[PDB]
Amino acid sequence: MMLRYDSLLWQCTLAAGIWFIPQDVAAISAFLLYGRSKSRTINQPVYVDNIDTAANEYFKRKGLDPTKMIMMRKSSKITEIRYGEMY
Amino acid sequence: NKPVVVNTSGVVNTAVLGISGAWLYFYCVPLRRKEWYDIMMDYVHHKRTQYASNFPDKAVRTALRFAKV
Amino acid sequence: ARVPEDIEFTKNRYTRRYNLATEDRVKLLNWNAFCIAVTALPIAYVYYSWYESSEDTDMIYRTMDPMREAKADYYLPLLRGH
Amino acid sequence: MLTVDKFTRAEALQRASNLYYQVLGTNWEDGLNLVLDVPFWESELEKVDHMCEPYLCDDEIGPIIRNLHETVNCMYACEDVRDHINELLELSSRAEGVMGSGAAASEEVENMPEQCGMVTKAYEDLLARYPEHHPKIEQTVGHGLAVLRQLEKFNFKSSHRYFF
Amino acid sequence: SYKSAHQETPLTYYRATQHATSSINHRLAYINAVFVIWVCDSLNDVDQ
Amino acid sequence: ANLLLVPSDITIIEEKNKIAKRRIRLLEKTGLALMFPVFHWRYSKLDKHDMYNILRRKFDPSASDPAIDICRRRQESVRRRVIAQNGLLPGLLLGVSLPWWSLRRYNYQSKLIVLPFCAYFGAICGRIAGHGLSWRWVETDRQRMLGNLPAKVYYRPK
Amino acid sequence: MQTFRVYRYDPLLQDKPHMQEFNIDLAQCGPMILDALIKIKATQDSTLAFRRSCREGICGSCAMNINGKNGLACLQYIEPGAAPIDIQPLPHTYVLKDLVPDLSNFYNQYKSIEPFLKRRRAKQPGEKEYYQSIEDREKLDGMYECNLCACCMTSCPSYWWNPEYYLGPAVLLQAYRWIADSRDEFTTERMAWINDSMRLYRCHGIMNCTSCCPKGLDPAKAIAKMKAAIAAAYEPGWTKIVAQESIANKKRESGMMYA
Ligand SMILES: CCCCCCCCCCCCCCCCCC(=O)OC[C@H](COP(=O)([O-])OCC(O)COP(=O)([O-])OC[C@@H](COC(=O)CCCCCCCCCCCCCCCCC)OC(=O)CCCCCCCCCCCCCCCCC)OC(=O)CCCCCCCCCCCCCCCCC
Ligand SMILES: CCCCCCCCCCCCCCCCCC(=O)OC[C@H](COP(=O)([O-])OCC(O)COP(=O)([O-])OC[C@@H](COC(=O)CCCCCCCCCCCCCCCCC)OC(=O)CCCCCCCCCCCCCCCCC)OC(=O)CCCCCCCCCCCCCCCCC
Ligand SMILES: CCCCCCCCCCCCCCCCCC(=O)OC[C@H](COP(=O)([O-])OCC(O)COP(=O)([O-])OC[C@@H](COC(=O)CCCCCCCCCCCCCCCCC)OC(=O)CCCCCCCCCCCCCCCCC)OC(=O)CCCCCCCCCCCCCCCCC
Ligand SMILES: CCCCCCCCCCCCCCCCCC(=O)OC[C@H](COP(=O)([O-])OCC[N+](C)(C)C)OC(=O)CCCCCCCCCCCCCCCCC
Ligand SMILES: CCCCCCCCCCCCCCCCCC(=O)OC[C@H](COP(=O)([O-])OCC[N+](C)(C)C)OC(=O)CCCCCCCCCCCCCCCCC
Ligand SMILES: COC1=C(OC)C(=O)C(C/C=C(\C)CC/C=C(\C)CC/C=C(\C)CC/C=C(\C)CC/C=C(\C)CC/C=C(\C)CC/C=C(\C)CCC=C(C)C)=C(C)C1=O
Ligand SMILES: CCCCCCCC/C=C\CCCCCCCC(=O)OC[C@H](COP(=O)(O)OCCN)OC(=O)CCCCCCC/C=C\CCCCCCCC
Ligand SMILES: CCCCCCCC/C=C\CCCCCCCC(=O)O[C@H](COC(=O)CCCCCCC/C=C/CCCCCCCC)COP(=O)(O)OCCN
Ligand code: SF4
Ligand code: F3S
Ligand code: FES
Ligand SMILES: [K+]
C-alpha cells in the first residue's frame, strides 16, 4: 500500500501516544503509589544484619523448636523460614 | 468539644448533591456519552452477510453433525 | 461463492421472507432481555450489602439504644482525629 | 386482540392517522430505523386494527386503514429487497481484503450479474405492485441499485435517472 | 467487459490535520479510561 | 543488608491450634485453581498458596479459646474469598461467546471493537456474582480484616 | 526535470492498478498540475485519461488527490523537488479509468435535497422579483459559491465508511443554503427531512472538509449551524410533515427525491 509519514493513520497514532501515554503513566503510577502506601503500613520491609542471629531470636520469642523449622534462601537478600511439618 | 447537638444535615446534603450531580451528569448530559452508538453506526451497521462463512456457525454446525443432531 | 439466484422476496406484510433485518430485530430483543436480567446485580448489591464494623454494633443498639432515641454525649476529638 | 380498553371513533381515527404518518415519514433507507421502530409499529398496528375494526366501512377511517396497511406492506417488501442488496455490497467489500489491500481478501461473488438481474427484477415488481409508494421505493431500493451499479455494469430502466 | 476498480483505504496515505488528530483523541477518551481501569485491576491482582 | 521472611503471628497460632487436616471442598479446589498468580515484588498480600494452607487446617468447632475463635473466623473469610473466584470464568466465557455468536455474521472490525469490551464486562459481572453469592457483601469489617492478614511478615528484630 | 507518478488503471484489462512515473521538464510546462498532466498526455502517453474543462477553477471537474490532499489540479501549483509528485483519483471512489472517478452517488445525493426554491403560493400576475434585503442576501455568501468538485466529499472519513447513507459535507452545505434562504418557505420541511442520524449526524467535526476546499468555503461551519437550528426548532409533528411531503411527491418520476 501507499504509506506516508504525514498520513492520517501514522499521525493519529503519534498524536494518540503523545496525548495518552503521559496521562496513563501518571494514572497508573498514582494507583501504584496508593498500593505502596497500604503495603508499607501493613508489612514494612525490615533489614537484619545477620540472618542466623535473627532466626535464633525469632525461634526463642515464638517458642518454636529450630529442628522442625526449615530455613531456605529464596534470593541473595531474601531468606524465608517455613514449617517443616505442614500439610 | 462537647456540643449538645451536631448539625449534619447541611454537610450530608452537600455531599449527596455533589456525588449525585457528578454521576447524573456523566450519565445524562454529555454528548460523549453516546460515543458507543456512533462507533457501532460508523463501522458495524449494515456490514453483515449470511453467505460468508464464520467460525461460530461452523463450530455449531460441526458439533451438531458430530452428535448426529 | 455463488449467491442463490431464486430468492422469493417479501411481497407484503403477511408473506414475508426471513432476512437479516428480522434477525437483527431478534438481536434487539435478546440484548434488551439481557439488560433486564443484568439489572438484578446492582439491585442485589444494594439490597444485600451491609456496612458494619463488627457484631458489637447490633449488640450496642440492643442494650444501649433500643428505640434509636438515646442521646449520647458528644466528644469531638473521638471521630475528628485531633 | 385481547384487551378491555375502549376507544371512541375520534380516538381511533387519531391513532390510525398518527401511525400512518409515522411509518410513511420515517426514513426506510436507514436499516436501524426499521429495526428499532418495527417492533413499536407492530404493537401499535395490532391495537389500531382492533379499535378500527367497526370502522372499516367508515368514509374517514376506512381510507386511512387501507393506506396504513398498504404502507406496511410496502415497507416490508422494500426492506427485504434492500436487505439482500446490502449483503451483496458487504460481500464485495470483504472481497477487497484488509485495508482494501487484498491482504486477507475473501472469495468474490461469481454470479454478480445474475444477482443484479434478480434484484432489478424485484425492483420492477415493487413499482408495479405499489404505484403510490414510488418515493419510498426509490429511496430504499432504487438508491441501492445505484450503489450496485458502481460495482457492476448492468442495465435497468431507471439507470439514466441515477446518472448512469 | 469493463469493470471499475475500488481504491484502498485512504487512511494509509491521506494527509493528516492537527484538528483531525485531536478529534480522534476526543473520541478515544473513554476507551483509554476503560484500558487504565483494566490495568489497575490486573495490577491489584497480580502484583505484590 | 538482608531481609528475613518468617510466618506471621496469626500463622503461628493456626499451626499451634490445628487438630487435623480439613478436606478441601470441590468449589474450593476450583476456586484456588482459577485464582490468578500473584508475583511478589514485596510481601503484603495473601496468595493462592497461603490460602490453601489456611483451608487445609482443621479447628475444633466447640473450642471457646479466643485465639481459636480468631482462627475459625479467618478461615471462613478465606473460604468465601476462594469460592468467589469460581464466578470469574463463567462470566468471561459468556462475555465472549454470547456477543460473538450475536455478531457472527458481521465484519471483523465489529468483533474487534465489541468483543474485548464485552469480555471484560462479562468477567466483571461474573466477579460481582461470585463475590455476592459467596456472602462477601455481608462480612463485617472485622471478618474482612482477619481474612486479609498476611501469612508472611518481614522479621522485626527486638 | 520533475518526476510525476500517476495512478493508472485499464478498465478492459482489469489489472491491479499501479503508479507509473513520468519525467517532465517544468521549463516547458505550465505552473499548475493540470498543465503537467496535459503535457504528459500530449507527448509521452496519450492513453492517460482525466476530467478537465475550465482552467480557472470555477467548474470543478479536475478534482484529484495530489500528495495525499484533495484539490483541483488547475489551481494546484507544481512544487518541484526530489520527491516524485504522486497524483491519484479522489479517495475511496470507484475509478472508471486512470484518474477519472465515479461520482454518480454524489450527484444522486445532491438531487435528493431538491435544490430548487419552493413557495406555497405561485407567482401572482404582475408580481416582480421576490423581496430580499441585502442583509438576508448576505447570509448566502459563503454557501452559494460551491462548485460541487467533491473534494470535501471524499476527504470526510464519515463519507469513507458510509458513502450511501451519509450525505457528506457538500450536500449538507447546499441543504443549509436553501434552509437559510429567506425566499424559501419550506424551511421546516427541509429541516425535518435532514434531521436523520445517518444523513446529518455522521459528521464528527473532523474538519478535513474545510481544509481541502478549493474555493475556501467552510462546510464544517455550515453543518454545525444546521445542527443547532434543527435542535432548537424540533417539534413532535415533524415526522408527519415529512410524510405529507412524501405524499405530494407520489407522481414524480424515478430518481432520488424528498421522501
Ligand atoms: C469496562 C466494562 C464495560 C465495557 C463495555 C461492555 C459492553 C456491553 C454492555 C452491555 C449492556 C447493554 C449494551 C447495549 C444494549 C443494546 C441497546 C440497543 O440496541 O439500543 C439501540 C442502540 C442505541 O440505544 P440507546 O440506548 O438509545 O443509545 C445509547 C446512547 O448512548 C444514549 O444513551 P442515554 O441518552 O440513555 O445516556 C445513557 C448512557 C450513558 O453512557 C455512559 O455512561 C457513558 C458510556 C460511554 C461509552 C464508553 C465506552 C466506549 C467504547 C466504544 C467502543 C470501542 C471502540 C474501539 C476501541 C478498541 C479498539 C481496539 O448510556 C449508554 O451509553 C449505554 C450504557 C450501556 C452500554 C454502554 C456501556 C459502556 C460502559 C463503559 C464503562 C466505562 C466507563 C468509563 C468512564 C470514564 C469517565 C472519564 O442503537 C444500536 O443498537 C445501534 C447499533 C448500530 C450497529 C448495528 C448493530 C445491529 C443492530 C441490531 C440490534 C443489535 C442490538 C445490540 C447492539 C450492540 C451490538 C454489539
Ligand atoms: C462521574 C464519572 C463516573 C464514571 C464511572 C465509570 C465506571 C466504569 C466502570 C467499568 C468497570 C470497572 C470495574 C472494576 C472492578 C475492579 C476493582 C474493584 O472492584 O476492586 C475492589 C475489589 C477487588 O479487590 P480485592 O478485594 O483486593 O480482590 C482482588 C481481586 O478481586 C482480584 O480480581 P480477580 O482475580 O477476580 O480478577 C482479576 C481481573 C483483572 O485482570 C487481570 O488480572 C488480568 C491479568 C492479565 C495478565 C496477562 C499476561 C500476559 C502475558 C504476555 C506475555 C508476553 C511475553 C512477551 C515476551 C517478549 C520477549 C521479547 O481479571 C479479570 O477481570 C479477568 C481477566 C481480564 C478479562 C478482560 C480482558 C480484556 C480487556 C479489555 C480492555 C477493554 C479496553 C480496551 C482498550 C483499548 C485501547 C486502545 O472488587 C471486587 O472484589 C469485585 C470485583 C468486581 C467489581 C466490578 C464493579 C463494576 C462496576 C460497574 C459500574 C458501571 C458504571 C458505568 C455505567 C454503566 C455501564 C453499564
Ligand atoms: C448438566 C449439564 C447439562 C444440562 C444443563 C442444564 C439444562 C437446563 C434445562 C432447563 C433450563 C434451560 C435454561 C434456558 C436456556 C434456553 C436457551 C434457548 O432457548 O435459546 C434460544 C436461542 C434461540 O432463540 P432466538 O431468540 O431465536 O435467538 C436466535 C439466536 O440466539 C441469535 O441470538 P443473538 O445473536 O441475538 O444473541 C443472543 C444474545 C444477545 O446478547 C449478546 O450476545 C450480548 C450479551 C451481553 C453482552 C455482555 C456479555 C457479558 C455476559 C455476562 C454473563 C453473566 C455473568 C454473571 C454470571 C456468572 C456466573 C455466576 O442474547 C443474550 O445474551 C441474552 C441473554 C438473556 C439472559 C436472561 C436471563 C434470565 C434471568 C431470569 C431470572 C432468574 C431466574 C428466575 C429467578 C428470579 C429470582 C428473582 O438459542 C440459542 O441461543 C442458540 C444459539 C446457537 C445455535 C446452536 C444451538 C441451538 C440449535 C440450533 C440448530 C439449528 C439447526 C438448523 C438446521 C436447518 C436445516 C435442517
Ligand atoms: C442549592 C445549592 C446546592 C449545592 C450543592 C453542591 C454540590 C457539590 C459539593 C461537593 C461535594 C463533594 C463530596 C465528596 C464526598 C465527601 C468527601 C469524602 O468522602 O472524603 C472524605 C473521606 C473520609 O476519609 P476518612 O475515613 O479518613 O475520614 C476520617 C478523617 N480523619 C482520619 C481525619 C479522622 O476521605 C477519604 O476516604 C479519602 C479519599 C477522598 C476521595 C474524595 C473524592 C472526591 C470526588 C471528586 C469528584 C470530582 C468530579 C468532577 C471532576 C471535574 C474535573 C474537571
Ligand atoms: C410517576 C413516576 C414514576 C417513575 C418511576 C421511576 C422508577 C425508578 C426505579 C429506580 C429503582 C432503584 C432501585 C435501587 C435498589 C434498591 C434496593 C433496596 O434495597 O430496596 C429496598 C430498601 C429498603 O431499605 P431498608 O432500610 O429496609 O434496608 C434494606 C437493606 N439495606 C439497608 C442493606 C439496603 O430501600 C429501598 O426501598 C430503596 C428505594 C427504592 C426506590 C425505587 C424508586 C421509587 C420510585 C417511586 C415513584 C413515585 C411515583 C410518583 C407518583 C405517585 C402517584 C400515586
Ligand atoms: C477493510 O478496509 C477497511 C474499511 O473498509 C473500507 C474501513 O471502513 C476501516 C475503518 C474501520 C474502523 C476505524 C473500525 C476499527 C478498525 C480497526 C480498530 C482496525 C481494524 C484492522 C486491523 C486491526 C488490521 C487487520 C490486522 C492486520 C492487518 C495485521 C497487522 C499485523 C501485521 C500485518 C504484522 C504481520 C507481519 C508478519 C506476519 C511478517 C512476519 C515476519 C517475519 C516472519 C520475519 C522473520 C525474520 C527473521 C529474521 C526470522 C478500516 C480500518 C479498513 O481497513
Ligand atoms: C483534579 C480533578 C479530579 C477529577 C476526578 C475525580 C475522581 C474522584 C474519585 C472517583 C469518583 C467515582 C466514584 C468512586 C467511588 C469509590 C468508592 C470507595 O471509596 O470505595 C470504598 C467504599 C467504602 O468502603 P468501606 O467499607 O467504607 O472501606 C473499605 C475499604 N475500601 O466501598 C464502597 O462502598 C464501594 C461501592 C462500589 C460500587 C460500584 C458501582 C458504582 C456505580 C456508580 C458509579 C458512580 C461514579 C460517579 C460518582 C460520583 C463521583 C464524584
Ligand atoms: C450457559 C452456560 C453455563 C456454564 C456453567 C456455569 C456455572 C457457573 C458456576 C460457577 C460460578 C458461580 C459463582 C461462584 C461461586 C460463589 C460461591 C459459592 O460457592 O456460593 C455458594 C452459594 O451460591 C450458590 O449456591 C450458587 C449456585 C449457582 C447455581 C444456581 C442454579 C442451581 C440449579 C442448577 C440446575 C442444573 C440442571 C441440570 C440438568 C441436568 C440434566 C441431565 C456459597 O454457599 P456455601 O456457604 O458454600 O454453601 C451454600 C449451601 N450450604
Ligand atoms: S465545498 Fe468546496 S471542495 Fe466541497 S464541493 Fe463545494 S467547492 Fe468543492
Ligand atoms: S470532514 Fe467530515 S466529519 Fe464533518 S466537519 Fe467535515 S463533514
Ligand atoms: S478544470 Fe474545472 S476546476 Fe479546473
Ligand atoms: K428559509
Automatic annotation (TrEMBL), chain A:
Q: Name one Pfam family in it.
A: Microp_apicomplexa_9
Q: What's the name of the protein?
A: Uncharacterized protein
Gene source species: Perkinsus marinus (strain ATCC 50983 / TXsc)
Organism lineage reads as: Eukaryota, Sar, Alveolata, Perkinsozoa, Perkinsea
Automatic annotation (TrEMBL), chain D:
Pfam families per the record? DUF6827
Residue ranges annotated for the DUF6827 domain, each copy included? 9-163
Q: What is this protein called?
A: DUF6827 domain-containing protein
